[PDB]
Amino acid sequence: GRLRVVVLGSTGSIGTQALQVIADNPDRFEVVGLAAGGAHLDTLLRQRAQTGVTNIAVADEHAAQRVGDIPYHGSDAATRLVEQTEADVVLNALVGALGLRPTLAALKTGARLALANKESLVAGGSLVLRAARPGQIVPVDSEHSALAQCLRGGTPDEVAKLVLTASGGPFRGWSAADLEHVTPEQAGAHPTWSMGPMNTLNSASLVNKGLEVIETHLLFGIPYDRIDVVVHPQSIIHSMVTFIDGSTIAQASPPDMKLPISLALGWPRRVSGAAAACDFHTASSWEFEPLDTDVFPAVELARQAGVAGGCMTAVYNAANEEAAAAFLAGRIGFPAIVGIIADVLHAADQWAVEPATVDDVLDAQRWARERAQRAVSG
Amino acid sequence: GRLRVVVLGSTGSIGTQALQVIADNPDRFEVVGLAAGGAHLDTLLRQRAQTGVTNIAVADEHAAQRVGDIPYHGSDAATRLVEQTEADVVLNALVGALGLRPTLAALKTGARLALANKESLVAGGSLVLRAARPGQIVPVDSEHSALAQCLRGGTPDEVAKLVLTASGGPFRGWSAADLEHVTPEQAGAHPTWSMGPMNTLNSASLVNKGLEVIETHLLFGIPYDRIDVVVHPQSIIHSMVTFIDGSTIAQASPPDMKLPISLALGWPRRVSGAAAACDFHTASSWEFEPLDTDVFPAVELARQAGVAGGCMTAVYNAANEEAAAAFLAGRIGFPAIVGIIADVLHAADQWAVEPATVDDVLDAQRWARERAQRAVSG
Ligand SMILES: NC(=O)C1=CN([C@@H]2O[C@H](COP(=O)(O)OP(=O)(O)OC[C@H]3O[C@@H](n4cnc5c(N)ncnc54)[C@H](OP(=O)(O)O)[C@@H]3O)[C@@H](O)[C@H]2O)C=CC1
Numbered sequence: 186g187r188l189r190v191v192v193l194g195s196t197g198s199i200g201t202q203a204l205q206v207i208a209d210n211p212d213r214f215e216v217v218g219l220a221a222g223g224a225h226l227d228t229l230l231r232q233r234a235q236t237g238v239t240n241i242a243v244a245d246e247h248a249a250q251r252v253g254d255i256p257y258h259g260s261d262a263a264t265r266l267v268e269q270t271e272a273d274v275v276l277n278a279l280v281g282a283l284g285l286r287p288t289l290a291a292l293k294t295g296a297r298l299a300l301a302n303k304e305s306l307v308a309g310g311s312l313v314l315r316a317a318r319p320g321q322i323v324p325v326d327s328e329h330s331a332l333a334q335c336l337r338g339g340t341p342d343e344v345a346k347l348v349l350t351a352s353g354g355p356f357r358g359w360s361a362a363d364l365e366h367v368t369p370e371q372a373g374a375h376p377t378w379s380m381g382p383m384n385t386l387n388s389a390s391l392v393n394k395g396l397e398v399i400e401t402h403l404l405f406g407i408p409y410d411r412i413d414v415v416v417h418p419q420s421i422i423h424s425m426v427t428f429i430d431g432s433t434i435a436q437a438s439p440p441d442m443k444l445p446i447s448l449a450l451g452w453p454r455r456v457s458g459a460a461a462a463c464d465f466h467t468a469s470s471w472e473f474e475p476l477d478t479d480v481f482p483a484v485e486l487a488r489q490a491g492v493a494g495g496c497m498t499a500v501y502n503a504a505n506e507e508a509a510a511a512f513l514a515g516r517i518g519f520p521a522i523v524g525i526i527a528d529v530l531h532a533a534d535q536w537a538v539e540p541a542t543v544d545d546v547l548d549a550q551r552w553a554r555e556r557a558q559r560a561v562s563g
Numbered sequence: 564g565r566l567r568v569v570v571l572g573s574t575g576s577i578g579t580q581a582l583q584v585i586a587d588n589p590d591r592f593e594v595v596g597l598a599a600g601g602a603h604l605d606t607l608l609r610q611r612a613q614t615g616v617t618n619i620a621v622a623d624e625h626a627a628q629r630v631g632d633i634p635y636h637g638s639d640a641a642t643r644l645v646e647q648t649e650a651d652v653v654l655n656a657l658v659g660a661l662g663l664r665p666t667l668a669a670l671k672t673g674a675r676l677a678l679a680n681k682e683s684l685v686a687g688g689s690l691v692l693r694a695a696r697p698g699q700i701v702p703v704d705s706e707h708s709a710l711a712q713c714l715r716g717g718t719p720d721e722v723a724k725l726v727l728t729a730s731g732g733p734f735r736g737w738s739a740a741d742l743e744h745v746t747p748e749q750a751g752a753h754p755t756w757s758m759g760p761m762n763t764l765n766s767a768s769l770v771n772k773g774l775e776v777i778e779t780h781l782l783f784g785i786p787y788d789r790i791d792v793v794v795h796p797q798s799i800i801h802s803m804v805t806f807i808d809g810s811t812i813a814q815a816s817p818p819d820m821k822l823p824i825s826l827a828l829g830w831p832r833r834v835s836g837a838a839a840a841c842d843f844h845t846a847s848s849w850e851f852e853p854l855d856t857d858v859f860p861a862v863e864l865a866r867q868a869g870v871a872g873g874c875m876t877a878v879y880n881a882a883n884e885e886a887a888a889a890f891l892a893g894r895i896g897f898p899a900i901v902g903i904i905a906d907v908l909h910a911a912d913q914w915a916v917e918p919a920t921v922d923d924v925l926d927a928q929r930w931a932r933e934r935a936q937r938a939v940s941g
C-alpha cells in the first residue's frame with residue numbers, strides 16, 4: 186500500500202533526502218506532515234508548495250509568524266504534529282535530545298518509527314525501549330541499517346560480535362597535539378559524508394561513534410563487550426556482524442543516506458534504485474585500521490556510560506551537546522569537548538539509575554548541561 | 564539430533580577437512596560411510612580406525628584388496644555405497660564429473676547433498692536439478708556458501724546481481740605471452756588456498772571460476788546475465804549479492820574450507836568455532852580489480868556454454884578434464900587448456916539439447932574428451 190509518512194526535520198540533510206526518495210516513489214510513499222525549526226523558511230515554503238502539504242510544524246515562533254497559517258508552532262509543535270496526524274511511518278530526522286518527546290509520541294501512535302535522530306534513543310534509553318513493540322523502531326543510521334541487514338544472516342545465539350565501521354573523521358591519524366589547533370571550519374569538513382553540522386562535528390570528535398555504540402546496544406540487545414569499532418576510511422562498508430562459526434557478513438555501498446532512508450520507510454521491502462551500487466568493474470580497495478583510542482577516547486567513554494546504564498547515556502549526550510556548542514561558539518578548544526564529557530561523567534554516579542518517567546531523563550540532562558556549562562566557564 | 568554423514572572423497576583435501584569438523588563435533592555429526600579412489604591407502608587406513616567405519620567404497624580393485632575388509636570396489640562402488648547406506652547428509656567431495664552417478668543416487672535417497680563436487684552439477688545440469696527437491700542441495704564450494712548466506716539479505720525479487728570473487732590464481736596479471744611458459748609446478752601452487760591438484764590447476768586457468776558461474780546459475784536459479792565475477796586477491800570476501808536498492812551484502816573470513824563445510828553439514832545451523840574470524844585489531848585491506856578476459860576467457864566461455872544449455876556445460880567440463888590432463892602430462896602448453904575448451908565448445912552444436920537420461924550426459928562427455936584428445940594430438 187501507499188504509506189503515509191510524517192517527516193520531522195524536513196529541511197535538514199536527512200529530511201531533504203527523504204523527501205526526494207518519497208517524490209521518486211509516489212506509489213509507495215506519501216508525505217502527510219512536515220516539521221522544521223524555522224531557520225530555513227525558503228526551503229519549507231518550497232516544500233509546502235511542491236508536496237501540497239499544509240500540515241506543518243515550525244518550532245521558532247518568530248519564524249512561524251513570518252510565514253503564517255501554520256497549524257503547529259512553538260517548542261512542542263513537532264510533538265503535537267505527531268500526536269494529531271494519522272500516519273504509518275514517522276521519520277524522526279530532528280537533531281539532538283529534543284527529538285525525545287516526538288519519538289515517544291511516535292511510538293504511542295503505534296506507527297513505525299524510522300529513526301535518524303539517534304540522540305533520542307541514546308537519551309531515552311530503556312524508556313524508549315519500553316514504549317516500543319518488536320520491530321517498531323527501524324534504524325535510519327547507516328551503521329544500524331547495515332547491522333539489521335547483516336543480522337538476517339543467523340539466529341540470535343549465533344551472533345559473536347557486532348562491528349561498527351567509523352570513517353575516522355577529518356582528524357584520522359592526527360596526534361593529540363594536532364587536535365589542540367582544530368577550528369570549527371576544519372571539524373565541519375567530513376571526508377566521506379555530507380551531513381548537518383551536529384553530526385559532522387560529532388563525527389570529527391568521535392562522539393558520533395560513541396553514540397552509535399550505545400545505539401547498537403539499545404537497538405540490538407548485544408552487550409558492550411561484543412560491540413567493536415574499526416576504522417574504515419572509505420565508509421563503503423557500513424558495518425558487519427561476526428558469527429560464532431567465524432563467518433562475517435558485511436553491508437556495503439557508496440555512501441548515500443537515501444539507501445538506509447528508503448529501507449527504513451518501506452521496511453522490510455527494498456526500494457528499487459534508491460542508491461548506486463558498488464562498481465566491481467573498477468579497481469578499488471577497502472581499508473581497515475584500529476581506532477586510536479589514546480587520541481580519541483570518546484568511544485571508550487560511551488562504553489563506560491553505557492555499562493553504567495540508566496540515565497548515564499543521557500548524561501553522555503547532554504554533556505556533548507553543551508560542550509560541542511561551546512566549541513562552535515569559540516568558548517573552548519576542540520580537545521575540551523571530550524575532556525568535558527569525561528569530567529561530567531566522572532561526577533555523574535547518581536544518574537546510574539533506570540528512568541521511570543521522561544522527567545527523570547530530562548532531570549539527568551538538565552544536571553549534565555549545568556555541569557558542562559560550569560566546566561566551560563571555569 | 565546427531566546427523567549421519569557419508570563422505571565421498573574422504574581422503575582428499577575437502578574430505579580430510581570434513582572429517583576434522585566431524586571429529587570436533589561428535590554431538591552434531593557421525594560418519595557412516597567413506598569413499599575414495601584407492602591412491603592414498605595410509606590415509607584411508609587412518610580414517611577407518613578413527614571413525615570406526617568399515618562401510619567403505621574404494622574405486623581401484625587392487626587397492627581395495629591391499630587395504631582389506633572393503634565391502635564395495637570398482638567404478639560403481641561410490642554409487643553403490645550411497646544407494647545402500649542410511650544417511651541424513653551425503654558430502655560429495657569426489658573430484659571430476661565421475662561424481663555424477665553418486666550425486667544422482669544421493670538425491671534419490673532424499674538425503675541432503677552437501678556438494679563440494681561442482682563438476683557433477685555442471686555436467687548433470689537439468690538432470691541433476693530434476694532429481695533434487697528444493698533446498699536438498701547445499702553448497703560446500705566457498706563462493707556458493709557465501710552467496711547462500713548473503714541471500715538471507717532480501718527476497719528473491721530483490722536480487723540484482725550475484726558477484727563471485729576470484730583470487731586470480733598464481734598468474735593474476737600475467738600476459739598471454741607469460742602463460743606460454745607456465746609449468747605444472749607453477750600451476751600447482753595457489754596463492755590463497757590449499758587444495759587438491761585439479762581445483763588448484765582449474766583455479767590457475769580460471770576454468771574453476773567458469774565452473775562456479777555455471778554452478779551459481781544451477782544452484783540459485785539466477786540468470787547468467789545477473790552473475791558477475793570480480794578479482795579479489797586476498798580471498799577474504801568469498802562472494803557478494805547486490806540488491807535492487809543498491810545495497811551489497813558480502814560474506815568474509817580468512818580462507819578456511821572448514822567454515823563452508825561446517826555450514827553445509829549443519830544447514831541452516833552454524834557450527835561454533837568452525838574457523839577463525841576476520842581480526843580487525845590489525846590493519847588490512849580488501850582489494851578488487853577486473854579480470855582481463857583477453858588473457859583469461861574461461862569465465863566468458865563458461866557463460867556461453869551455460870546459455871547454450873543442455874549438455875553444453877558437460878562438454879565444457881569434459882573438454883577441460885581432457886586438456887588439463889594433457890597439460891599435466893607435458894603434451895600441451897598451459898594456454899592450450901582454455902584454447903582447446905573453446906575449440907571443442909564452438910564445434911559442439913549437436914549437444915545443445917537437454918539430456919533425457921544420464922547416458923546422454925555420458926555420451927556428450929565422451930564426444931568432448933575425444934574431440935579434445937584429437938586437438939592435443941594435432
Ligand atoms: N545527515 C546525515 O547523513 C546523518 C544524520 N544522522 C542523524 O539524523 C538526525 C538529523 O541530522 P541532519 O539531517 O544532519 O540534521 P540537520 O541539521 O541537517 O537538520 C536538522 C533538522 O531539524 C530541524 N530542527 C532544528 N531544531 C529544531 C527544533 N527545535 N524543533 C524542530 N525542528 C528542528 C531543522 O530545521 P531548520 O534548520 O529549518 O530550523 C532541520 O530540518 C540527527 O540526529 C543526526 O545525528 C544520522 C546518520 C547520518
Ligand SMILES: NC(=O)C1=CN([C@@H]2O[C@H](COP(=O)(O)OP(=O)(O)OC[C@H]3O[C@@H](n4cnc5c(N)ncnc54)[C@H](OP(=O)(O)O)[C@@H]3O)[C@@H](O)[C@H]2O)C=CC1
Nearest residue numbers: 572573574575576577599600601602603622679680758759
Ligand atoms: N579443496 C578445496 O578446497 C576445494 C575443492 N572443491 C571441490 O571439491 C571436490 C574435491 O576436491 P579436493 O578435495 O581438492 O580433491 P582431492 O584430489 O584432494 O581429493 C579427491 C578425492 O576423490 C577421491 N577419488 C579420486 N578418484 C576417484 C574415483 N575414481 N572414485 C572414487 N574416489 C576418487 C580421492 O581418493 P584417493 O586419492 O584416496 O584415491 C580423494 O578422496 C572437487 O570437485 C573440487 O573441485 C571446491 C571448493 C574448494
Ligand SMILES: CC(=O)N(O)CCCP(=O)(O)O
Nearest residue numbers: 326327351352353354388393
Ligand atoms: C553516515 C552515518 O550514519 N553517520 O553517522 C556519519 C558517519 C561518519 P563517521 O563514521 O562517524 O566518521
Ligand SMILES: CC(=O)N(O)CCCP(=O)(O)O
Nearest residue numbers: 704705729730731732766771
Ligand atoms: C576455495 C574455493 O571454493 N575454491 O573454489 C578455490 C577458489 C580459488 P580461485 O578464486 O578460483 O582462484
Ligand SMILES: [Mn+2]
Nearest residue numbers: 326327328397
Ligand atoms: Mn551513523
Ligand SMILES: [Mn+2]
Nearest residue numbers: 704705706775
Ligand atoms: Mn570455489
